[PDB]
Amino acid sequence: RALSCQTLAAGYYHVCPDGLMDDGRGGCVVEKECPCVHNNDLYSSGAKIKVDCNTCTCKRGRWVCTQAVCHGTCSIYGSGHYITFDGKYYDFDGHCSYVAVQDYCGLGSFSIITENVPCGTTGVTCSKAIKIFMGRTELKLEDKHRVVIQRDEGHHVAYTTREVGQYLVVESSTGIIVIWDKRTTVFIKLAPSYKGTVCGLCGNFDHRSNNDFTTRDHMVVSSELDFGNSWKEAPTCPDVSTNPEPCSLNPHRRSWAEKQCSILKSSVFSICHSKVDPKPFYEACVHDSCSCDTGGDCECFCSAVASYAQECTKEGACVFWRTPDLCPIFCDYYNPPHECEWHYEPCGNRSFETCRTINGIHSNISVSYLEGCYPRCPKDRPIYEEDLKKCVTADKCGCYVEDTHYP
Amino acid sequence: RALSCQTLAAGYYHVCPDGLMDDGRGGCVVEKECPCVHNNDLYSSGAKIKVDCNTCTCKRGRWVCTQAVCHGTCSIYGSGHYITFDGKYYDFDGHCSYVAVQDYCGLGSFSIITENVPCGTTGVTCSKAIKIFMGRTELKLEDKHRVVIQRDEGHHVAYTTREVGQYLVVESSTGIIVIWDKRTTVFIKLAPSYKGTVCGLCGNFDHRSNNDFTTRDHMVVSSELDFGNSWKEAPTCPDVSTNPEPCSLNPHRRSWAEKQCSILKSSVFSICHSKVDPKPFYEACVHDSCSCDTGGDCECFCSAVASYAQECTKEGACVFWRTPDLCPIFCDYYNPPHECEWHYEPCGNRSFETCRTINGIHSNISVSYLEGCYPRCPKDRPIYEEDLKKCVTADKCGCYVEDTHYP
Amino acid sequence: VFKSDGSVLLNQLQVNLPHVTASFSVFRPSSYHIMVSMAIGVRLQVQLAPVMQLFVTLDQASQGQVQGLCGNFNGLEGDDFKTASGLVEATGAGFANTWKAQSTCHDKLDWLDDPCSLNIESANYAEHWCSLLKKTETPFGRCHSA
Amino acid sequence: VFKSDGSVLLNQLQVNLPHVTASFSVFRPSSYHIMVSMAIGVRLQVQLAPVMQLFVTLDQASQGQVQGLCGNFNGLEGDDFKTASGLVEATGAGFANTWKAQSTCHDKLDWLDDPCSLNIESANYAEHWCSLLKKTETPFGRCHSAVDPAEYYKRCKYDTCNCQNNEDCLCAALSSYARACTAKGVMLWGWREHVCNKDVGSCPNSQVFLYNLTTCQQTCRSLSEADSHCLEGFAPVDGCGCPDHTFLDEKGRCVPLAKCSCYGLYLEAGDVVRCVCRDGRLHC
């Protein structure tokens, strides 16, 4: 009988005396003061960690966590890669308009459409436009900007568009949040009131992932290509009959792709290796770089390495991976000529005063993990007015009525 | 699944249809009307049999019997053979006076003593006198008669002596009954108030036979010769150190003994073979006839064959085994010169009027199984007065005060 | 199943000895002896040579709680011939026909004969060698005191 | 205990197979396959050649009621790395160090390498033979409509480049695509003719190599019980066996049905009890 504070719930089937047991840290410890392990770190008793909306506590070698329900996230990224709200990864290379999320599922209040076009010559497709339908308002995310289409007469569901780092962030008062890096990566977030009431290529958000491949006619199939071909918008769009292999159709681009994308499995990201699994991000980066064969492949690369480093910040590991030779960023472009306020914050974590939040206006999620260039406004005008990218005095910023900046 | 009304409680481990089952009599019978078996006879439903004081009933293939407690019987017979009140057979050939039954067991009310003398030359002993101590009255059974010794002044525990067949029967008002065939066989009976309150060579009468070999100093031994040597009355009497073998010490008497005593295992007693086990009565008869080597061995024989035929009557099988060449009986000796009233009743079963029972006086046990000569009094004086062996008119019989017949 | 050639078999399948389980265990120490112990309180010893014999041992906690051809184990031996439907039988072959495990077996009866009278050639061989249990020059007189 | 040479042993003592009890039963139909069925709802299949593998099957009544390295079986696969003390881990080697059955075992860590880059001589052998799972001229294109071999191909290259006996890892990974294709109806009759046929022709004189060997194709001693040990619910395996008739005798070759056996000891086909020994059944 030699217990170990890690084999408590194993069963002791097949040093410390009777009573005391090992802790994995050092000497023999009683059962009450036993520590806890989480992602290869060792936390003593009464320690506090957060898990995405909740707070936990190492009590007696076990974790005691609060039970609140967090927001759910769908991902669309690169050359046709998906993660559903329930966490199912798949690949679909379709060339039409597809339902991403909607609640017109068998009456409804929103719809989000993705427009996937061929990017390359191998037959893989990537997402190049997002259409957001909220009631009768139609936004559209296209050509690095948001466009308002068909604003209704007096309803006007309250939405907000602002720019956080390198991404554009649309939020709605009804609980719908769309985050877009202005090229191919989209993040949709829904408030936890939408549990089990959505469908599309992002699943149905009911914390059970063996029914995310439900087709439009309410049938759970096992194929990625019978599911994804049923959410196309036009009936005359073709069916995808196989998934392409880009590094087999381009044998000459494989050696560059597997050497550039090996940063993720290297010692640069070694703080995140125990917190986020790098293996589906390595395979996405190689799939993306073998297939950008018509032009601009160092943009297909730097997006795939920033999809992994974003998860690392979100889990508690800030990694600084960019150099002047590998994916450089140009943040002193935005400075007033040589007064240096715009700095590259590699993991976003800074909470400064805008001219929204000085008047109480706050968001419903935490977007303080988004990479980009952030201001550090001086002490004669310390209030950042967002719609012009200028630091202003707290009096002279603007108006913000009907989602339009008025000076 | 083929049940049989005999294998009900077996378990059916290793013809009639489902439902019905065999009865051992013939065709298939339901479970409710199933018969019963007892001593190789087959009794249908609702049949009544008696077992020694009780009454049973074949109900549903099982017996439903009443629960009353019967009298208990000790036996002493032949050349040192015993049966205790709990039914344990043993042999002891002691030459002293021995305690048969008493309740002065570690203060007391009776004692029955047996006087065992050598009968033969081989060292076996048989019982030749009985002393009955009841309070302060002392009877003694000796020389084919009862003798009153020391009748106390005013207590005089009420006893009764009468002659039933070939035996002499003493009864007491306190529940003590002694039956004596005037040679060597004794039967003691106790009322069921004496349960667990006696000791001696007859055991202790508590319906549990693995403690009948309790010695005088309250020690359960496993030897027949340490138990029996502890109930001798005088300290200067010797100890019996082995049991003799008479048919080995008399090889010339074995061929006669085993041929005469083979009546018991023969077709004469074949009605009793399923009701009383003949095997310990065959072995007693051969042990008794090899050892009556000083004179009168046809008396040692005829007593051993009448010990078995008495059990047969008691269990319901009247056998007539005597002939003019084998153990004759002389019952027309008692007749008035040639008026023929005394008949040999081989199994006793006749209930006539005496001059006791015409005045209400009745016994507490049933002695109507005792072999002997019985009267059949005529129809001008049909009342048998017992103390003179005369049939008398119902008026002129006697008095019966203080256990004495007064004409 | 304990056949009379060894050949212990569990559920119509041969087993290898020893065979120790959670509720019972079967041993074989001397190739003519099988020892079976149970957690309930039942112990068996099966003899295989010269002839097959069986010895069964119960604890005294199971006293008055068994039925079979071995009696009920309550201290009295007058009621061992008591059948499972009431009353005590007289003879051993009348008691034991009530414990047939098969319904198609015939009824057996006693036999009031001795075999040493039916065979004159076997009865001198039986007398000479079984008398060694009684004479004291042999190594059987040491047990005569017990 | 199921050692990797056969050698099933109960409580540190060898047992003879079959072994049928009240709560479980262990079978051995094909000498490289052990089938264990339990009355609780647990079924095991232990593979012994080329490499040792294990397959476990639970009913859907035990759904959300198990813990181990096999997850908790609740429909979601995001919480399979949830440890027995709270929270979900990130990597497989961090989850699985919480299920050590011995306290004195060291902690293991992941390995972000591929074996087909560390070995240049094994990576051409892995490419040529594991590509047969993807090309349609072979008897593996029949399963491409049901099983989608793109994830078996990635593991076939993994195990072939990694282990020291590269053919035993090839033939184990090709026999796991064929195993998981017979689970969806499509059975591959005769996929071992060019690739892993080093044991096909080594069957004995009367019995041949089969692809649908099951428990209840046994001897006539199995016909004596015929309802006690059949154990439906398993998968068919590939080994040496007898054809559509001529059931297996007591030893050696498999004679036809007329003079099989009469099983007690299995008597020959000349014995009369009054039950004459006949074809399978007895006239009793």
Ligand SMILES: *[C@@H]1O[C@H](CO)[C@@H](O[C@@H]2O[C@H](CO)[C@@H](O)[C@H](O)[C@H]2NC(C)=O)[C@H](O)[C@H]1NC(C)=O
């Ligand atoms: C964050 O979520 C809350 C909760 O829904 C939003 O508050 C709603 O705002 C709309 C109009 O803006 C009202 O009609 C609702 O009644 C409000 N809800 C409640 C429960 O009072 C809030 O608008 C969201 N934040 C932002 C910035 O939009």
Ligand SMILES: *[C@@H]1O[C@H](CO)[C@@H](O[C@@H]2O[C@H](CO)[C@@H](O)[C@H](O)[C@H]2NC(C)=O)[C@H](O)[C@H]1NC(C)=O
């Ligand atoms: C049969 O037994 C009864 C019951 O003991 C005897 O009745 C007793 O008789 C004596 C005197 O004869 C009385 O002192 C007792 O009180 C009686 N007992 C009861 C319970 O009343 C009866 O005497 C016995 N029969 C014979 C013939 O003696």
Ligand SMILES: *[C@@H]1O[C@H](CO)[C@@H](O)[C@H](O)[C@H]1NC(C)=O
């Ligand atoms: C296996 O399949 C073959 C077909 O060639 C046939 O013998 C039968 O269907 C199966 N054999 C069995 C079940 O013994």
Ligand SMILES: [Ca+2]
């Ligand atoms: Ca789902």
Ligand SMILES: [Ca+2]
């Ligand atoms: Ca007693």
Ligand SMILES: [Ca+2]
């Ligand atoms: Ca008993």
Ligand SMILES: [Ca+2]
């Ligand atoms: Ca799960």
